[PDB]
Write a protein that binds this ligand. Structure first.
Ligand SMILES: Cc1cccc(C)c1C(=O)n1nc(-c2ccc(C(=O)O)cc2OCc2ccccc2)c2cc(Cl)ccc21
Ligand SMILES: Cc1cccc(C)c1C(=O)n1nc(-c2ccc(C(=O)O)cc2OCc2ccccc2)c2cc(Cl)ccc21
Lengths: 264, 259
């Protein structure tokens, strides 16, 4: 037997995922379903009030055009999330023992996929939690931002809605995020073997986890792995979309040091 | 939710049908590629002269492109016939049958093309010829770099060491994908797929007992399939805007028409 070891690994990852991330899926769902009401941002006037009252970092002026300020706010939050994911990664058994350059490579090419996944935990069909659950910004507001910005937001919701239909919880997600990080096919890896060995363990752990936590949900393991397809696809789209924005928009300028920090 | 004996029954059914539908199996392709036999030896095409001589025994970049296109159309036909054998498939809504094939055929062609490849080239003309990777990769203009990604994929996929019995179930899983755009009734597709996935999982554990998480590693390859089918389309579009000298079979045109 090694069931106990797989459960040990699951528990280890769950405990660490709780410590590393500000707002769990469990907490975010309580807020979204309406089980300390979040401040709601559904239009320009309500944004003005929220930033004036709740004082949201990421959406506070440092460009004066709202659509840009919100776009940049997403960029800023994603960079903050990279540090959370980084810290989480260090807790995955075997990860810190990898070649240092491979650690960096794994995080570099994994973070986009992870941020999409985890963003779904904070979204439903009607909008997204921000500032650790204190704010709730509506899908319609985001989707109706002008020019390319509105069309940049909506794909994230489309993805989340489909992902959320699997009804994963945090104990499930902790293992799934681990699997994503330990992907042996990232470009420029020096030593793939020990990465795939760790991944094989995480996959075993995720499989057992899903059978016990969702015994009625046939082939959930397979369905979840199939979602890596949608993850890679949307990360590719993401890059194409940013580039068009870079080429087109003249008014995106921040202080150079900010650009450096939030270069992403 | 299915008993083992039924999962084994379904694997046997699909293997049998794969054999009937596809002329050149992986098992036959490997026997040809590894050689050590007198009767099954391919003529090898590695340059212009050898191409000339190959036609006698069995613009160049266009001729080869058209060669690939022609085989691909044949492959669609073979895949379509295999699909009809998959329990439940013909029972689906007819529009959904079309949709499943439309999105699925390209992924399957790449999968099955890998069976005919090693790192040095690809079987052609039902195993009678072998064209080298170096020759294909050195075709001019856009054509060379349209050939090479096929090999890049095959080398990785072939590392899993699937056999035909395995691939029959894997191909079936690809076709019955409930996430294809425009599907009208996802539920009955996903119910068939869940059976195929159970069948694949048991098949892999029995046929490759020492190969840990082969199931998962195989599903992860559906990711690479989706990516390369997408790049394919982008690349073919760019070809279709330099090359009027090259035209596309209606069947493939239609498959591409709105992907
Ligand atoms: C820029 C980026 C790089 C990599 C991955 C993604 C998805 C993006 C991106 O385009 N994003 N990223 C958020 C976002 C992500 C994670 C969290 C969190 O708390 O875990 C929060 C996020 O956004 C909160 C937010 C929403 C609106 C304004 C400011 C912050 C994201 C969110 C949306 Cl709605 C759209 C695109 C997003
Ligand atoms: C044009 C096309 C449309 C749709 C799908 C694909 C992959 C292509 C394409 O770019 N292809 N397609 C082959 C090919 C596929 C399947 C078989 C087989 O027998 O099952 C054979 C194939 O090629 C045989 C061949 C190779 C060289 C010369 C003449 C025939 C394909 C093969 C390569 Cl090496 C590169 C691109 C290919």
């Amino acid at each position: 037997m090694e069931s106990a070891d797989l459960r040990a690994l699951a528990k280890h990852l769950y405990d660490s995922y709780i410590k590393s991330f500000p707002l769990t899926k469990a907490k975010a769902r309580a807020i979204l379903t309406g089980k300390k009401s979040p401040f709601v941002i559904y239009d320009m006037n309500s944004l003005m009030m929220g930033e004036d009252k709740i004082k949201f970092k990421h959406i506070t002026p440092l460009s004066k055009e709202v659509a840009i300020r919100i776009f940049q706010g997403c960029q800023f939050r994603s960079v903050e999330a990279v540090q959370e994911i980084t810290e989480y990664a260090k807790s995955i058994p075997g990860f810190v023992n990898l070649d240092l350059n491979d650690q960096v490579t794994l995080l570099k090419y994994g973070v986009h996929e992870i941020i999409y996944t985890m963003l779904a935990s904070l979204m439903n069909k009607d909008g997204v939690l921000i500032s650790e659950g204190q704010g709730f910004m509506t899908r319609e507001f985001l989707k109706s931002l002008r020019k390319p910005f509105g069309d940049f937001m909506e794909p994230k919701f489309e993805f989340a809605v489909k992902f959320n239909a699997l009804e994963l919880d945090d104990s499930d997600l902790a293992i799934f995020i681990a699997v994503i990080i330990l992907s042996g096919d990232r470009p420029g890896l020096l030593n793939v073997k020990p990465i795939e060995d760790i991944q094989d363990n995480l996959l075993q752990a995720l499989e057992l986890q899903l059978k016990l936590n969702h015994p009625e949900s046939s082939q959930l393991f397979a369905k979840l792995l199939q979602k890596m397809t949608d993850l890679r696809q949307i990360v590719t789209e993401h890059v194409q979309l940013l580039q068009v924005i870079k080429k087109t928009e003249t008014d995106m300028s921040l202080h150079p040091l900010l650009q450096e920090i939030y270069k992403d």
